[model samples]
Target: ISLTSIPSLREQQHPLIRQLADCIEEVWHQHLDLSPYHLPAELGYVEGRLEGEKLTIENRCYQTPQFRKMHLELAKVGNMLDILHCVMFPRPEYDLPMFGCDLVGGRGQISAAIADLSPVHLDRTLPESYNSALTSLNTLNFSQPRELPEWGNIFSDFCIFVRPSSPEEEAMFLGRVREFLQVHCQGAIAASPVSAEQKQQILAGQHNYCSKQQQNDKTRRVLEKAFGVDWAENYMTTVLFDLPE
Candidate 1:
């Protein structure tokens, strides 16, 4: 858990980022068995520079009967910026919503927070159960709800993005993340493997998600500045987000 190293992620944490990271794994372990998803030697851990600020990235990945890859990445920039990103890609054979969350904090204040269980069907609609549960679970409110990125079509109607204004709002966001993951994992566990006839549609949905997510120049811009254009490209396609071949 090199990501747990002090100073950046610990002594200077935003108070909610680490909790969210641990909460995500705790909920996953509460549901199913997770096996390691190996990363390439170079992609496992990286150290670079972004505008003279030292940047370090630590990635952890796992797999399960229902999921193809569960990736959790923690990053620290100098002594101020800390990031947590988690995403679970379901196996095409199992029809499940794509679950993900991201938190960005700088100088002890969380500037961006988002969580979602995106639908993966060709028509881009979530399971009826998910839709109902999410709507009912949408009771919490925040002062400043952020807008989705231009590439946010991959997210579902239940998606939430906000700048948590206070400790109470941050707690609400954490609780919602727990509930969302629980719902997604339960749906995945109950899912029966789809027939080969439906694989193409599922694959298409995942392809769209990966492609649209890659359109996020913010991710690429930061990576390119820290590491290089080639490494940034490789990291995007090979590590952060990519579809099954």
Candidate 2:
């Protein structure tokens, strides 16, 4: 029968977690114990189960703090999984390579070019009758009267969720977020507003204590939106948050 749950990792040979855990075991075997490098890169693939949900996560570091950090990380992961609920899973059923690229634009017609490339890539990568049910996300940036308002509102809500305390904090945080977005998203631009506190921080010498907190909040939102919480706990996923997870 197909395995319905994550395997027992303690055994080190329990089929599902075997391959990944074995890699972890081997890494420690060589170093004689888990190392800084081994923790994050090699063995962060441990699975975690929580709240009646299962998720894959890791801390890379096999220490007490890492184990503790997993709890918060998984909660954030569960939140994201809810957000992208329809966008992932079941393998080939939801496989659309186009989603892999960030489709934001106005950059010399890049958006249009990517759209043109979608169908052909789907045909080449997936068989006919294949579709990923993404009504809200159809057409990277759309303009239908009904959709425009909600789309703008939805994104506006997202901005509110990730808002910094003021302008300076917002600007600095945006810099970090933009850098990552550009690298992975093929150069897209999506801006959000800031708060008075962030503005004050910039004017008052740019201390990011509050600003950092705001960024951390954003990171949690992103993780929660991407993967289910359970998977997040054991996943070692990173986001805008200040505290490591």
Candidate 3:
């Protein structure tokens, strides 16, 4: 029987998440050699049943010849979906701005979204050309400031925040996300490698970011409710907020 046939798993599965995954995989293959990262047995392809809700997770990672790494994950619980996508370059070289995208969705709707090319040092700065391109990509959505929860502080100023309340808003948000992904991918393809000193700064910045995410109570609370506190702790360390190896 299909997993969806189960009562706890009954919910509308959004296609935007699947499309994003496909597009990202296709682009990665075009630009770099991609491989799968093997997580510890306890953390890989984890599944849990809680509160009449079925939860599942999928995590994947790849390393490139350019000494960069990419990670993608999907977490689903009942009618809610969460996504994490990021790319980081290795030390002594390849220290361009990192690409990050996050989304949280409820049945037939999105609750929050973030799309940004975060600098390694938390400066939230971008090249003028890239800044203009990214701004134009918004297509007039998310024009006003909204208060995001604590975890949202990690985002750059150019980040998109939307509470899509209607079908049209949802469509626009998805299109915006797709365009942002394409723009970020192009930037990644053209990014230059950094020197040893620059790499040190990048690594430090990334480590601090990860630490902050790990300490985010909202993330911890959600994961714990879905997967139990212990597994949630491990998930934060080994999957969600993992630092470069």
Candidate 4:
């Protein structure tokens, strides 16, 4: 297992995009014992077409001792959209929450920003440790707090979705992302693998999370139009929110 080369999204105007991108990778390296997680060669760096505009996706993925896969994906749709997505999927045997963050920027400004340390348990509750620690962090960032999409129940109570108004606001948003990542990494390092029926429950929780995420037609529609439905489906299931079971 080795570190796979992750293509760059390079320069960007959205203030937090590059900062969050670098932070996500840095935190993972700081906390986890990393190893390569095979992302099919053809998918690592790929090209697409969206309404006559060129689209490209670059992904970085790794597996840790306590997690099945840690994925960071960056996508650009011509010069109109720059997207960032990062998620850490715990191994089936580990009793842990799923950590995720996403940013969508367009036209020299950011339109959407979201992050969460979602629960991966049947009760749909985060670990008590997560709940207590998260409650103490600063949640107020932007005055214009955004609503979650219809398929948002998969997310935990600590989830935050907002469109920041300025660099100060973006800094606040990024601060929370960093905090969430730190807490999750600490929690994961201290977590232990489960056994017996507990293992089955964890797998079930993960499958549900993936299935619910697949319902996001916003994601599906974009990828489907750019790449065919079949290819988009494969990308979603295999790369973005794959089920470990």
Question: All predictions: root-mean-square deviation over Cα?
Answer: 2.7, 19.3, 4.6, 2.3
lDDT of 2 at 31: 34
57-117 per-residue lDDT for model 3 (tens digits): 6666777655355777666777655544444444326555556666667565666666666
User: Which candidate tops TM-score?
Assistant: 4
> What TM-score would you give candidate 4 relative to the actual structure?
0.93
Q: Against the unseen true structure, what C-alpha lDDT does each candidate score? A: 0.83, 0.24, 0.63, 0.85
lDDT of 2 by residue, 1-245 (tens): 23345533223212212222333334334432222333333333434444544544333223221111111111112222211000000111121221111111121111110111121121132212222222122232222112222212112111211222333433333333333222212211111223655333222221122133333323343335345655333332332111221
Cα deviation at 226, candidate 4, in Å, is 1.2
Cα deviation at 190, candidate 2, in Å, is: 22
| Candidate maximizing lDDT | 4
- For the record, the alpha-carbon RMSD of candidate 4 to the native fold, in angstroms, is 2.3
Q: On residues 109-222, what C-alpha lDDT tens digit does candidate 1 reach at each position? A: 899999989878656699887788778775877899989876787788788899998899999999999999988888888899999978778888888888777767356877
- TM-score of each prediction: 0.92, 0.21, 0.79, 0.93
* Clashing pairs in model 4, backbone N/Cα/C closer than 3 A: none
Candidate 2 contains a number of clashing pairs equal to 31
lDDT of 2: 0.24
Compared with the true structure, the alpha-carbon lDDT of candidate 1 equals 0.83
How many steric clashes does model 4 contain? 0
Q: Which stretches of candidate 2 lie over 4 Å from their true place?
A: 1-43, 58-140, 143-240, 243-245
